[PDB]
Design a protein around this ligand. Structure first.
Ligand SMILES: Cc1cc2nc3c(=O)[nH]c(=O)nc-3n(C[C@H](O)[C@H](O)[C@H](O)COP(=O)(O)O)c2cc1C
Ligand SMILES: Cc1cc2nc3c(=O)[nH]c(=O)nc-3n(C[C@H](O)[C@H](O)[C@H](O)COP(=O)(O)O)c2cc1C
Ligand SMILES: Cc1cc2nc3c(=O)[nH]c(=O)nc-3n(C[C@H](O)[C@H](O)[C@H](O)COP(=O)(O)O)c2cc1C
Ligand SMILES: Cc1cc2nc3c(=O)[nH]c(=O)nc-3n(C[C@H](O)[C@H](O)[C@H](O)COP(=O)(O)O)c2cc1C
Ligand SMILES: Cc1cc2nc3c(=O)[nH]c(=O)nc-3n(C[C@H](O)[C@H](O)[C@H](O)COP(=O)(O)O)c2cc1C
Ligand SMILES: Cc1cc2nc3c(=O)[nH]c(=O)nc-3n(C[C@H](O)[C@H](O)[C@H](O)COP(=O)(O)O)c2cc1C
Ligand SMILES: Cc1cc2nc3c(=O)[nH]c(=O)nc-3n(C[C@H](O)[C@H](O)[C@H](O)COP(=O)(O)O)c2cc1C
Ligand SMILES: Cc1cc2nc3c(=O)[nH]c(=O)nc-3n(C[C@H](O)[C@H](O)[C@H](O)COP(=O)(O)O)c2cc1C
Ligand SMILES: Cc1cc2nc3c(=O)[nH]c(=O)nc-3n(C[C@H](O)[C@H](O)[C@H](O)COP(=O)(O)O)c2cc1C
Ligand SMILES: NC(=[NH2+])NCCC[C@H](N)C(=O)O
Lengths: 175, 175, 175, 175, 175, 175, 175, 175, 175
């Protein structure tokens, strides 16, 4: 039943954005998700280049407001469309904006507009992860109902074990 | 005495920015305000275009620091000039920045520098308004002394009943 | 049957272009028109900004020839699509071009290509409206079959009583 | 009493635009006009360069709408300000636009907004002056109340005897 | 004697502009014209591209005033040079400008300066050709001495029978 | 039955690119082909301009990878879409790239990805056509299964008799 | 041992950024620091100009991510390099971002990556310093272990007594 | 001794360029190579973005000639430095250029300048791999001494079994 | 008779382009050639700068197609004008393009259009000269009738003994 679940996938400016192809193959070839739309922060776009993400996912990523066509607006259209929202990788920056309701780009505004199970997979090095401000944001996001997948230590952070959390959200959404 | 009250009017990137000419007619033709200066966020400017706002309000809206002339700085000059400060429409983004003392553009820096009665009229859809982070920001601004005019649901949010709140601030300033 | 009438709406560089969202809500929420496509002159676009018009009307306004996609050309495609053509607001400039068959932008070329009931609602101040050249253009357009909605003088012109003229055209087209 | 007459001076893209400094000295040093504001067409600006006109006349010529600051608009502000309007040199192009109420730049829109004695001094070669279309425009402008100063043939047209026509208009305005 | 006739050829932004090479081959290889200079409107240049026209006709087409080198000006130089003037294809826009003596680009200014037999071959669809304003312009041009070659209906207009009209003008010029 | 054949049409930077509208009129108005998509080399686009080709073929020509939308990449998507591939006119440059499996722009990459009847119609002058390297490429392309329409000598080459070759390919595809 | 302490120096967009050369002279000529690297916010760079700071500090200030060379990333590299981190002057804006773990430019990302004694010297006028949001941010940073040097009000704030706090930080780092 | 082998790594504009981070981790963390420098084609750079490649490999990739500093030139310096040269992924385009000695960018010029064991790993879809010209290029490169790792068919080609070929080349170079 | 031989001289992006002034003086002051026109590749222009070649040879080099004026095209005009064609210095890249009939810039297209004795003087280092692909291109060009002047090893290649080969070509052309 996962084939009709609409997965919205946000990508932030982290080293781990290089994992996007591998994660996309897992989502499509192992989990069986069919409808995936991506939103890139401006920093993610500058590091990875948005054109290859488009070719490998089948949709141009949304980065600028101008990418939404017609009535309404990118964050409302994407927020209403999403059955599951995954932010992977998330930056420490994203955690702060999401925890405090900041909405100064397409991704963080879409967070305010989405009403669906949401998984956030932050990545950063150990010094950043240990800062009290970062941990306050992690705690705040959990109290607001977001599923946080803590990073691992791949020596330089790396993605945590997100597969189970994402599958849980997809199954909850399918139900 | 309402003709000498100096009204600073901030405009954020909301659907409801199209209401600015209408609100301006109400401010001038019904309330009797004469001296009105506007500050637009970059997003408001990108959606609405500043040249028509200039034509109907009599002053070019300030968006970049470059729009302030001479000594000081835009936020200090506008902040000291204001007898009443109105943010209409305010974005969810604005609420987050004002609640936490962020000052990363002219408008939010002017908020820190202004010392006058302030009315904030946020606009956003129902999904965004219901987010815990947004409501924390609303509550925090009320605790800090800001007057919040809650949005309506105009089917896609719409401006609340701001006329009474703004009139009260203009009259309190006249005294 | 008014929901199937295809309304083409031209917008010129007048002060009254700020009224476009209000007129759009009236057309949709009261008259019941569903398919509305807009053409903005370069001057209208420079004053009002097309991105907010796009967001509230559901279609990007056409200004440059490049905005039409595929075969043909913007004026032929838009002219053939239209069941009713409304120019609101119209400039004095527009009256001169339409009256003499000038076609030096998309809007005035579409006028030549459209074969449907057309309502023109010019706006300008009293000095401009009284010019002999302007009145010759008004007279000539009426002789050519165009419905002219004369402006009011709301102190600086304002839109006349167009609702009856537009309703008539939508109803005549529905038949 | 001619020193308080406000002279609005339009300049078109003619060979005879080189006479603007000489005419400016005559207007100020011989006729005694004190308040002179210039409007240049885009073509006039491209041939003559706008910065020197500013340095020798004391005011930046208006060419783009952006040159008007504050409320309203260039054509209304200049049109209401003018006590006498002089177009010198005028192009054949200008005659056509003025004769038909075309208002597609600041100059020709200001013509529609001005309500004062107006002198037009066209310049062009003999082949152009003799065209039936040009003479229809000359006749139409005279019937509309404009004073036309016909060119001479200085071998390639040259300015006619405009001094008497301008002086008459300034005197009519003073009364 | 047709080899010494100087043919000035204006090209407007019509679907039929693709015929310029074919007409050029006919003029050179069948009629025997040797000296052919082209003027393109800005819209014609935007559609057809002047570099290919230059390569097949032997002269760079003139579009901007800057394309004329040395003393004088493009419209005077080209107008005095022409023994025959052909506008092919002509737009509805051109008919309006030529009929009313508008001279707001090189081509329409050259029309005012040329004193030679002139052939105009307009192209437009049936709806545009049927407009009263267009037919007024056609009638006015015929009264002023211009030869109009009415279009065909090639299904989207197509060029009329210009071969006879142009040959006649070229032979008339040779005499 | 030829109306559903998907024709992919490459255009190279040759003098004979001016023939594209004529060939298109024959393909659409006589043969009945309905879906025609073009790929222009950078040189073809710079000489001919893509805007008119778009207007008469119904699709914007593709030159840059970004001109193609969505997943798969331009050469794979266009190569798979094509039922017939026609290169007309082809440059000597193209023959060389096609003969050697060079794929350094969209067109030559699309050649590698296309699996359909293909007609190549080179045009060049006699000196270029006689070069040994050029004739090696022609021979090599014939051995690889491509249908070559050799140019004629039309004073400077001209297109050969391509209609029969193209008709044959369109019929093979429908079969 | 103070000559080997690696001092990372962040500069925000405050009036007091003009004091950077004087503070640099004290750090080098009186305290004895040798290796000083600066990070400027975009607003600081726009105010002070990074070329003179480079000339007097010996290193180009880092503002954009592109300034870091090789592996890793500016914030990790600068954050790991720093033995002491000084923000002087800090804006109210900086206080908000640092207090909430926002990392939306190089400077604030480096704060999260740094693991060293940090001194923050905010500057702002009296109205801004008295805002509740600003004072919450000051308190939060103190609880997080940051040393805050409160501003003075030299009539428009001015730097507080940072010499004691910075010398303390530099000396502890040498130990 | 594999840690001192200098590996030069060329990257072409293929879908499989997203595997560059994964392949880099294997080269560093499993094979133990320490000095790896990359050269990207313009198309590879446009797809993947060189900034993330720089951050994860420790060296900015070379794409433009300007990236070489000092005497000589990029292709000579990189070609002499290389102990093993790996092109992964290689495009069909690369195969053609390398097979025919074309050197029209940094990568293909470096191939001519390198004198070391070279492994080429082409990727392309099944239609492209089966083209006769492509297979001629594969055969020619093998005859010239290049190691070709044929692609796989991962349904859109995928990298072949390069691990064995690269390990062999690195080990032979260490010996 | 060598003073009337028209020498066309192509310059590629090699280190040895610094020899162009020396070769030009030898050609003019010692051999006596009077009519010399140069063609530079984009790479030659980017390395050497085109302005000084113009100053020292008396002609601006042709690099872009836009440099040819009037009918035809740069490669046809230059190819027909040439009595002798010299490529000095030639790159390895040039050898490949000439050997395979590639014509993707003005120079390599002029090679296809030229019908005259041609001397090619390649320069490259020893590693590049020894590549099988390069020697295949040398061999193919000799079989096609081109005179190849092999480089020397100036320790980094240097021009071979071209004087005899060029003199032979110029003298044969005079006959
Ligand atoms: C190459 C590179 C890798 C980065 N990786 C991370 C990361 O893994 N986690 C993180 O919090 N920030 C990382 N950053 C810093 C962020 O990109 C920076 O905070 C940025 O402002 C975040 O923008 P965004 O959250 O809007 O995408 C990295 C920066 C660079 C240049
Ligand atoms: C057409 C359009 C309409 C929008 N309307 C709203 C809105 O009504 N309320 C809101 O919170 N955000 C709205 N947004 C999203 C904001 O523009 C976005 O959060 C932006 O970052 C806010 O910028 P600002 O607060 O600096 O003006 C809209 C966006 C677009 C493109
Ligand atoms: C702020 C502003 C408001 C204007 N309002 C009007 C108007 O109401 N009526 C009018 O005829 N011209 C008005 N103009 C002048 C026109 O914009 C000008 O004539 C322009 O050339 C018309 O362009 P268009 O008809 O192609 O839109 C206004 C100009 C400005 C700058
Ligand atoms: C150097 C030069 C001199 C010109 N002189 C005249 C002139 O004297 N009279 C005229 O009608 N046009 C003249 N023209 C042509 C006009 O500039 C042209 O018609 C233009 O479109 C008029 O623009 P404007 O009326 O908006 O200023 C001249 C053009 C050039 C390049
Ligand atoms: C592809 C295309 C074809 C057009 N064909 C015609 C035409 O055949 N006749 C016409 O009157 N207008 C046609 N138009 C509209 C004109 O180009 C438009 O009126 C333009 O402003 C005329 O410019 P010009 O008269 O200065 O060339 C066409 C537009 C496009 C985009
Ligand atoms: C006006 C013009 C016409 C040309 N005609 C031809 C031609 O007919 N045949 C040819 O092989 N090259 C011709 N060329 C040269 C090509 O444009 C040149 O070789 C170019 O590099 C080919 O680019 P493309 O194959 O990617 O389209 C012409 C060049 C110009 C400027
Ligand atoms: C000339 C000038 C001086 C300023 N001085 C201060 C200041 O002293 N303190 C402050 O909090 N903001 C000051 N501001 C406002 C900040 O520049 C503004 O908040 C900005 O967005 C901060 O950017 P940053 O924190 O990234 O450096 C000043 C602005 C200007 C134009
Ligand atoms: C998204 C995308 C993926 C591509 N993947 C391949 C590929 O895997 N193999 C291939 O031969 N060409 C592929 N191409 C086409 C090449 O990019 C094209 O041939 C290009 O000119 C090669 O450039 P290069 O060899 O200089 O890197 C792809 C193109 C795009 C836009
Ligand atoms: C400074 C410099 C010197 C070069 N010298 C040579 C050379 O002597 N021989 C060669 O084959 N390539 C040389 N190259 C590489 C060529 O410039 C490269 O192959 C280029 O793509 C050739 O372009 P062209 O043949 O169109 O001129 C050099 C490159 C640079 C940056
Ligand atoms: N000669 C060809 N390749 N023909 C195309 C084969 C497919 C066939 N036209 C079906 O239908």
């Amino acid at each position: 039943a996962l084939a009709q679940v609409r997965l919205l996938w946000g990508v932030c400016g982290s080293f781990s954005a290089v994992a996007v192809p591998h994660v996309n193959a897992w989502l499509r070839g192992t989990v069986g998700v069919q409808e995936i739309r991506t939103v890139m922060t401006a920093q993610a776009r500058a590091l990875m280049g948005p054109r290859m993400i488009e070719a490998v996912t089948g949709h141009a990523p949304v980065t600028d407001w101008e990418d939404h066509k017609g009535g309404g607006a990118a964050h409302v259209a994407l927020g209403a469309w999403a059955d599951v929202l995954v932010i992977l990788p998330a930056t420490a920056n994203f955690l702060a904006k999401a925890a405090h309701g900041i909405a100064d780009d397409v991704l963080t505004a879409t967070v305010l507009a989405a009403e669906c199970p949401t998984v956030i997979a932050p990545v950063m090095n150990a010094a950043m992860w240990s800062k009290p401000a970062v941990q306050r944001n992690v705690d705040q996001l959990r109290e607001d109902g977001y599923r946080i997948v803590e990073p691992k230590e791949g020596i330089p952070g790396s993605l945590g074990d997100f597969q189970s959390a994402i599958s849980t959200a997809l199954i909850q959404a399918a139900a």
